[PDB]
Symmetry: D2
Subunit: 259 residues, 4 copies
C-alpha cells in the first residue's frame, strides 16, 4: 500500500505475539525487512518470521529483554548486520498486572515501569543514535495506550508508564525534528490479542469492555498494524510528536453517551 516502505528496515519489540506480531506481518505485506524481537521462551517467533516472509517481506528473529541495555543494542545491531541499516524502530513490548495502588509492591511497579517505559526509552535512544550518526531520516513508533490519558485504577504502574511514554515521545520528537526524525505514539483501546483471549472468553467481561467502547466492538490487531504502517510511511511526513488513538472512541468518555 505504501510504496516507500518497500525495502525499509523495521525492528519491532514484543513481535512474537499480539500487536507486535500483527505489525510484523503488515510490514511484511509492505515488503519491508523486519527484525522480530521476542523475549519469552514460549512464543514461536519463527512462525511469525514465516508469516512475514509469506506476506512479501524479509525477517530475522532475535531474542532480547528490553530492560537490558545490551539486549536493546543487539536488536539494533541485528538490523545493521542482517539488512545493512535501520529505518523504523517500534517499541511495543509491554505488560500489566492488577493490584490496589495502596498495596502495589515496588517490585511490580518497577517491572512495569522498566518494561513499558524504560524499555521504550532504550529502544528509542539506540535507534535515534543510529539515525543521527548515519544521517537517516528515521522513524520511531512507541506503543502506548488509551491509558496515557485514561487513568487506570489497579494499574497505576501501567498508567504511569504510558503517561511517561507520552512525554518521552514528545520530547524526542521535539529534540530530533530538525534532523527529520519523527517520533510518535499509537494509543490502542481494547484489542483482541491472544494475551486478552482469557479475559474476553468470559462473556461478561467481553460485554463490559464492549460497553466502554462507543463503536461497540473490540478492535482487531490489524486495525493497529494499519496505523503503524501509515505513521512509518512518508504519507505521515509532517506528523511528529503525536499520539494517534485507535480506540473505537474510548478516550471520548463512554459514561457520557446519551443511551
Amino acid at each position: 500500500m505504501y510504496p516507500d516502505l518497500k525495502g525499509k528496515v523495521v525492528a519491532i519489540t514484543g513481535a512474537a505475539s499480539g500487536l507486535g506480531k500483527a505489525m510484523a506481518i503488515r510490514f511484511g505485506k509492505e515488503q519491508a525487512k523486519v527484525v522480530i524481537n521476542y523475549y519469552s521462551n514460549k512464543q514461536d517467533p519463527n512462525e511469525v518470521k514465516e508469516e512475514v516472509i509469506k506476506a512479501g517481506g524479509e525477517a530475522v528473529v532475535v531474542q532480547g529483554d528490553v530492560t537490558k541495555e545490551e539486549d536493546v543494542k543487539n536488536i539494533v545491531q541485528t538490523a545493521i548486520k542482517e539488512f545493512g541499516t535501520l529505518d523504523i524502530m517500534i517499541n511495543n513490548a509491554g505488560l500489566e498486572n492488577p493490584v490496589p495502588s495502596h498495596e502495589m509492591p515496588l517490585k511490580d511497579w518497577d517491572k512495569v515501569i522498566g518494561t513499558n517505559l524504560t524499555g521504550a526509552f532504550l529502544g528509542s535512544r539506540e535507534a535515534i543514535k543510529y539515525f543521527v550518526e548515519n544521517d537517516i531520516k528515521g522513524n520511531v513508533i512507541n506503543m502506548s495506550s488509551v491509558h496515557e490519558v485514561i487513568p487506570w485504577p489497579l494499574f497505576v504502574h501501567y498508567a504511569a508508564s504510558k503517561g511517561g511514554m507520552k512525554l518521552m515521545t514528545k520530547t524526542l520528537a521535539l529534540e530530533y525534528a530538525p534532523k527529520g526524525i519523527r517520533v510518535n505514539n499509537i494509543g490502542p483501546g481494547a484489542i483482541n490479542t491472544t494475551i486478552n483471549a482469557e479475559k474476553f472468553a468470559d462473556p461478561k467481561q467481553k460485554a463490559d469492555v464492549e460497553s466502554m467502547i462507543p463503536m461497540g466492538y473490540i478492535g482487531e490487531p490489524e486495525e493497529i498494524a494499519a496505523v503503524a504502517a501509515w505513521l512509518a510511511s512518508k504519507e505521515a511526513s509532517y506528523v511528529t510528536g503525536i499520539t494517534l488513538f485507535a480506540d473505537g472512541g474510548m478516550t471520548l468518555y463512554p459514561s457520557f453517551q446519551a443511551g
Copy 2:
C-alpha cells in the same frame, strides 16, 4: 493507494483553493467522486474539477456559503443527486483576520465563528443525518488547526472557533460511534497554501514561521491531503474522535528546543 476509497462520494467545503483543493485532487487520485463546494465564481472551481478527473476521479462543482443553512443542505443534496449517495463529508471552509482581542469587533468574531465552527456544525449535521437515515457507515473530517490547542493572540475568534470545533467533533464522534460513523479533526500547522503566499514571500516572515516549526519547513498541501485520505479510508477503521495534528511539531512547544 486506498482501494476502498474508489467510487466513494466525498463532499468538500472550501474546495476551490488551498487545502480543500489539495484534498479534492488527492481524492481524485484515490478514484473517488468529489463534490467541490466553492464560494465565489472568481475561484475557478472547474479547474479543480478537471484536475480531480485528470488524477483519476469524478467531480462536480456547487456554489455555497457554509454560513447559510440552505446552502449547506444543498451541498449534501448535490452529492446525492449527482452521484447517488454520500460517504465522506469534509468541512474545510474557514477564514481568519488579526485584531487585538480587546478591540475585536463583534462582526469579525461572528463571521469567524459562523464560518469556521457553525459552518462545520451544519455540514456535519447534514452529512450525519443522511448517514443515519440510510444506514451508511459514513465519515466526517473537520479541518481544525494547531490553534485548537495553541492559543492565538490577535486571532481570539479563530482560536475559539477551533477549540469549539474540537469538542463538537468529539461529541459527534461519541454520539454516532454506535452507528459506525466516524468523526475526526485534522490539525495542520503552517502550510504553504496560496492564501499564505504573500506572507511567505517576505523572507523575514517565512524565516520567523520556520523558526516555530521543529521539523524546520512549512508543510505542503499534499501532506495534509494525505492525512484526509487515510482518515477517510478503512485503514482508520478504529479511529474516531481524534485530532490528527500534522504540524512539523508546532504543538510540541518550539520555544523549549535545546538549540
Copy 3:
C-alpha cells in the same frame, strides 16, 4: 479569607441564580463590591444584593442580556459608575438544552453559542479594554464546564461553546499576561443549583449522576464560589490561562473505576 479582595470591584453575569449568586455572596464575605447582573425581572436580584450586603460586601444590581453588546458594555459601566473601577470580571451566564446533534436546530445552536461563548467573549473584551485603558492588573474568570474536555451527546452546542471558551480564555491569557491581567476558567462538574433540582429530585437520575462522580456526591455551589474567590485573589498571582476543574473527579473517566 483573602484580605486583598476587600474593596475590589467584581462584576458577575448570571448572578441572580445558582453559581453566579453563590459567587456574589462569597465575594460579599470577602468584603468586595459586587455588580450583580441579572437577566429577567422574574428573578429576584435584590435578594442576592441583600445577601451580599449581609455577608459583608457592597452590591448593585443591573439587568442585562449578554447576547447584546450594549448590555455587556453597560455591565462594565455600572461597575465604573457605582464603584469607581472594575477589578474582576466573571462571565458566568449560560444555558443548555438536549437535542440529538443530527436533529439540533440552528436556532438552538445559535442561542447556546451566543449566550455561553459570545457572551463571555463580549464580557472579557469589555473588561480587558477597561483594564488596558486604565493600567489595571485585572482578573477575568470564565465559567466553563467539565464539557470543555468531556464530550456531551445531545449537547453538542454546549460542548462546542465551552471548548471554544477554553481557547478564548487561553488566547486572552497569553495576549494580556504581559500587562499583569490574568484570565482563567473554572470547570464545574455536577453542582446542586436550583436549575438542576428537577433532575436530582428524581432519585434514579440523582443516583445515575452520582455514579459518574468518583467522589460520590453532587457538589454544592459554595464549592465553586471557593474556586472563584481563590483565582481572583493574589494567592493565584502566578496562575493564568488555566482551567481549574472542580468536578469530584468526573474528568478522570468514571467508567474506568475498579468498582
Copy 4:
C-alpha cells in the same frame, strides 16, 4: 488563611530547600504540624524547623531518601509517632540534569525516574494506605512541572517522570475518590529557588527564561506554596485529579505571542 488546616499534619519531601521549604513555612503560617523530610544534614533542616515554628506551626525533621522504600515508610511513621496522625502528604523531592536524549545514560534515567516518579508513587502509596486503614479523608499533593505537558529536550528523563506522575496522580485520585481522599498535582513554571540562583545570576539566562514567561517574571517560591495550601484545604473540597499550573503562562505557548 485556611482555618481547617490548623492542627493538620502535613509531611513534605525535599522540605529542606526551595519549594519544599517554602511549603513547610506556609503550612506553618496555617498553624499546621509539619514533618520536614530532608536528604542530607549538609542541608540545615533545623533552620527550616525553626522558621516553621516562627511562622506559627509545629515541626519535626526526618532524614530520608525517597528512592528507599523503608525511608518513605519512616516519613509517614514519623508523622504518626510525633503528631498522632497524617492528614496531607506532599511528594516534592526531585532532580534533573541535561543530556542529549540519544546519549542519555540509563543510570541518569533511572535516578530521575526513581526520585521524581517512583519516589512520589511510594509516598502517595504509604500515605493513602494510612488514610484507608484509619478512615482519614486525607490529601496528597504531588509536585510536578510544566514538563508534564511541555516536552523538554535534554531532559527526557524528567519529562517522562512528570508525564508519568500526572497519570499516577489521576489514577490514585480516581481509585480513592470514593473514600474522600483527594490527589492533585501542582505544575510550576520557572521559580526562583536557590538551586536556580546560579543560572538566574547570569543576566542573559535570566532574560532568556523571562522571554518564555508571558507574565514576564520568574515566580517566587511563596507563589507555589500558596497553591499547595489551597489544594490541601477544604476550599478545594471538590477538586481532585487535577494539575494546577502556576507558571506565569508558560503552558500557553510563548512563541505564539502577538509580538
